[PDB]
Amino acid sequence: TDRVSVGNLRIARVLYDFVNNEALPGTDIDPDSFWAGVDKVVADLTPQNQALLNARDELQAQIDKWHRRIDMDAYRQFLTEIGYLLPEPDDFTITTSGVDAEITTTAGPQLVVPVLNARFALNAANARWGSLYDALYGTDVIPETDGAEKGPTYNKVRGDKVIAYARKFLDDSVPLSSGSFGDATGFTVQDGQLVVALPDKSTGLANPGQFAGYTGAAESPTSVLLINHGLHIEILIDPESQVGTTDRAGVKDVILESAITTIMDFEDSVAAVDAADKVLGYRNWLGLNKGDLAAARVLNRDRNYTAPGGGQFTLPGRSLMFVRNVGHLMTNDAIVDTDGSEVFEGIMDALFTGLIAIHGLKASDVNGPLINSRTGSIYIVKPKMHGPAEVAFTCELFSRVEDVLGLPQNTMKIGIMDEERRTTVNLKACIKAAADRVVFINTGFLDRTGDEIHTSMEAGPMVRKGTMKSQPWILAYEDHNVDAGLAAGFSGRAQVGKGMWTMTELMADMVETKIAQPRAGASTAWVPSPTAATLHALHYHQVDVAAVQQGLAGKRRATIEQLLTIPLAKELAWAPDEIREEVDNNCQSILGYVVRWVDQGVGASKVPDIHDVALMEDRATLRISSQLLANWLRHGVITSADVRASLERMAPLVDRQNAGDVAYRPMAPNFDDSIAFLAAQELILSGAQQPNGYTEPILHRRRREFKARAAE
Numbered sequence: 194t195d196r197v198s199v200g201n202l203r204i205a206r207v208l209y210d211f212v213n214n215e216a217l218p219g220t221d222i223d224p225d226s227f228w229a230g231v232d233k234v235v236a237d238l239t240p241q242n243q244a245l246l247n248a249r250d251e252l253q254a255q256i257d258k259w260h261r262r263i264d265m266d267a268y269r270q271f272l273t274e275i276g277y278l279l280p281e282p283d284d285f286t287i288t289t290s291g292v293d294a295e296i297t298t299t300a301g302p303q304l305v306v307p308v309l310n311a312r313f314a315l316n317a318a319n320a321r322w323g324s325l326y327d328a329l330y331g332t333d334v335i336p337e338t339d340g341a342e343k344g345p346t347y348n349k350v351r352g353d354k355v356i357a358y359a360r361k362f363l364d365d366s367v368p369l370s371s372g373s374f375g376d377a378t379g380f381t382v383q384d385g386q387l388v389v390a391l392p393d394k395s396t397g398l399a400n401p402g403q404f405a406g407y408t409g410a411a412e413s414p415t416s417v418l419l420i421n422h423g424l425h426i427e428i429l430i431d432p433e434s435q436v437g438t439t440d441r442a443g444v445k446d447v448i449l450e451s452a453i454t455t456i457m458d459f460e461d462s463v464a465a466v467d468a469a470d471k472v473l474g475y476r477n478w479l480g481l482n483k484g485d486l487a488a489a490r491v492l493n494r495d496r497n498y499t500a501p502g503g504g505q506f507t508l509p510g511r512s513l514m515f516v517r518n519v520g521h522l523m524t525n526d527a528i529v530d531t532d533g534s535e536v537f538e539g540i541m542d543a544l545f546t547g548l549i550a551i552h553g554l555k556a557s558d559v560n561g562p563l564i565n566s567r568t569g570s571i572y573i574v575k576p577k578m579h580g581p582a583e584v585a586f587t588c589e590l591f592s593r594v595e596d597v598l599g600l601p602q603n604t605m606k607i608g609i610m611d612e613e614r615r616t617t618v619n620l621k622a623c624i625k626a627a628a629d630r631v632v633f634i635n636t637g638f639l640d641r642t643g644d645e646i647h648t649s650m651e652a653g654p655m656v657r658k659g660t661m662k663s664q665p666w667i668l669a670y671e672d673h674n675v676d677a678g679l680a681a682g683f684s685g686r687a688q689v690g691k692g693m694w695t696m697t698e699l700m701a702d703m704v705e706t707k708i709a710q711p712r713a714g715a716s717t718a719w720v721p722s723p724t725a726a727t728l729h730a731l732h733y734h735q736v737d738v739a740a741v742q743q744g745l746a747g748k749r750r751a752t753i754e755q756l757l758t759i760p761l762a763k764e765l766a767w768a769p770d771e772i773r774e775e776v777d778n779n780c781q782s783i784l785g786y787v788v789r790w791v792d793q794g795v796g797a798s799k800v801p802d803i804h805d806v807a808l809m810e811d812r813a814t815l816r817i818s819s820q821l822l823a824n825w826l827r828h829g830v831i832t833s834a835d836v837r838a839s840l841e842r843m844a845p846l847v848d849r850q851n852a853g854d855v856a857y858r859p860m861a862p863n864f865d866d867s868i869a870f871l872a873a874q875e876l877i878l879s880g881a882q883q884p885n886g887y888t889e890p891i892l893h894r895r896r897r898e899f900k901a902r903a904a905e
């Protein structure tokens with residue numbers, strides 16, 4: 194037994210040592226008082242945590258039975274009687290205070306990254322600023338048409354298209370008084386105003402207030418800092434660079450303020466099934482908050498400029514960090530009680546990520562340099578909550594953690610993910626439950642659709658996964674989320690977020706279509722990579738989110754009936770080949786993700802889909818796919834032979850898609866010999882029995898089984 198006893202707790206040594214030697218020192222928290230507080234919080238809050246999970250099961254059994262025995266009036270009457278659909282509270286304004294400008298004020302891209310991957314976490318934090326030239330040149334936003342494709346070395350024709358794209362962007366975002374940036378000859382700062390040399394004349398900006406600063410001398414600036422819709426744009430000037438020599442004004446690059454905030458994730462993008470895994474995550478979270486995290490490589494320093502009217506100012510070189518804790522469901526054996534019962538992981542995350550975040554509020558040799566929150570807040574995204582009482586519980590959890598940490602009450606702020614149906618239909622009350630802590634709400638596709646399928650599992654066969662994206666329930670869910678946030682005063686106070694673009698290489702399509710989200714009044718939305726953050730930033734220059742929000746406020750665009758419109762497939766709406774395609778699709782999604790999760794403990798990566806399109810999904814992809822297949826199985830759309838045959842067809846496909854990975858362990862031809870293959874099979878076959886369709890219990894068990902076999 195490798196555990197430390199503290200009150201009723203038996204703490205894994207690796208965790209206990211991490212906290213004492215790394216997390217605690219520099220916080221001024223007395224270590225014995227901390228550990229006593231951990232024991233007391235776990236003892237006090239565990240019963241309610243369990244009570245809430247029981248209530249999920251109780252409500253769902255009632256819903257299963259109701260469906261087992263189409264009319265909307267009877268259905269919502271039913272949901273109301275069982276306490277699933279609660280009355281809408283009175284109108285109110287959130288009272289959350291001490292929030293940084295990146296959240297209250299700036300609209301822009303939001304990156305989410307697996308905290309267990311230090312290099313990715315570092316790149317994400319550094320992604321507050323990104324190269325537009327690199328993003329345009331390196332992706333298909335500039336088509337690889339004849340002559341303009343990227344080879345082993347610099348293609349000037351392609352670069353010239355990159356340059357022109359960016360010139361057009363500057364014209365659109367920071368218009369000159371006359372002429373185009375495409376005719377620029379040079380830049381100078383005269384009388385604290387930006388002057389752009391043109392061929393036949395000279396010109397300032399149409400709105401000189403968009404001029405924000407510069408580097409080097411006003412005579413010949415090395416860069417020119419502009420602002421639009423709250424976001425900075427820096428024109429780098431160096432006619433001696435590879436591309437500067439080719440440019441008419443010697444422009445080297447255009448740098449965009451990109452990932453304004455980043456979510457460091459402990460939940461669905463990481464595989465962490467024991468104390469050693471949790472410690473890897475906590476240690477990286479620690480390094481980020483101290484500012485000394487280094488990989489293979491380090492965090493960027495802040496950026497120095499001269500204001501138009503002279504005098505120096507500094508801009509943050511890094512993304513403001515949130516941390517995403519796990520939700521209320523799972524336990525982890527990082528801590529067990531006397532009976533050997535595992536402790537609630539969400540409770541542990543609040544205590545440990547909260548402790549660690551104190552370093553990000555400080556700057557010394559002990560706590561590293563670099564401050565995360567200027568206003569003294571800790572930003573925690575709380576996923577997978579079901580309804581307002583589960584939000585209230587999170588409030589109580591954070592309050593008790595603050596007390597243990599010696600922090601001011603309401604220091605720990607909550608990002609409310611709206612990704613469960615019972616939260617969706619009671620969203621206003623969920624926000625009201627956290628009215629003095631809430632700094633965001635957001636929507637998604639996968640997790641929310643996963644819950645949609647599980648909740649109405651007994652209703653009938655569901656439409657295909659692709660179809661879900663355009664279903665009435667989900668479009669109302671998207672608008673209702675914005676409506677509730679705006680009605681509660683989020684504009685100027687808290688983020689209203691939308692979902693992830695998963696197609697990592699389809700940047701042209703993202704740039705074309707993702708603009709719909711800020712057009713919808715979302716002050717942020719999720720991107721999979723620093724490159725995608727820079728490109729998505731374009732949308733926020735193109736759309737005035739603040740103005741969109743002002744025009745939406747007070748509107749009620751969704752009905753409860755729309756929200757409750759179950760995505761049931763019409764009476765036999767598929768051909769055999771369409772059914773086959775959807776089974777293969779889902780089995781491939783499950784296998785492609787699971788094999789990396791169970792075998793290598795990777796919970797996010799570019800996974801080729803069935804059409805070889807690279808997707809960067811998290812564990813929610815598993816929840817939707819396994820629930821859909823379990824549903825089709827449940828209602829006789831497919832057979833158990835169909836499922837097994839697809840898994841066996843797609844498995845070697847997955848193996849093939851993983852050529853080029855040295856640590857990869859093939860699943861075919863001995864399927865029942867691969868723990869990953871069996872995990873994937875189990876997720877489908879036992880899908881209908883999982884609490885709310887959640888995949889963690891199975892995935893965690895299988896990864897743990899794999900670790901034990903690898904050490905035997």
Ligand SMILES: O=C(O)CCc1nc2ccccc2[nH]c1=O
Nearest residue numbers: 305462637638639640693810811
């Ligand atoms: O559709 C959904 O609900 C899930 C969204 C999502 N979150 C991610 C977080 C970190 C890394 C990759 C991710 N991919 C994703 O699709």
Ligand SMILES: [Mg+2]
Nearest residue numbers: 408409498499
């Ligand atoms: Mg300077």
Ligand SMILES: [Mg+2]
Nearest residue numbers: 482483552555
């Ligand atoms: Mg620090």
Ligand SMILES: [Mg+2]
Nearest residue numbers: 461612640813
């Ligand atoms: Mg989710």
Ligand SMILES: [Mg+2]
Nearest residue numbers: 668671709713
């Ligand atoms: Mg939408």
Ligand SMILES: [Mg+2]
Nearest residue numbers: 621676677680
């Ligand atoms: Mg409302």
Ligand SMILES: [Mg+2]
Nearest residue numbers: 422734736737
């Ligand atoms: Mg505008």
Ligand SMILES: [Mg+2]
Nearest residue numbers: 300685716739
């Ligand atoms: Mg805004």
Ligand SMILES: [Mg+2]
Nearest residue numbers: 881882883884
């Ligand atoms: Mg059940």
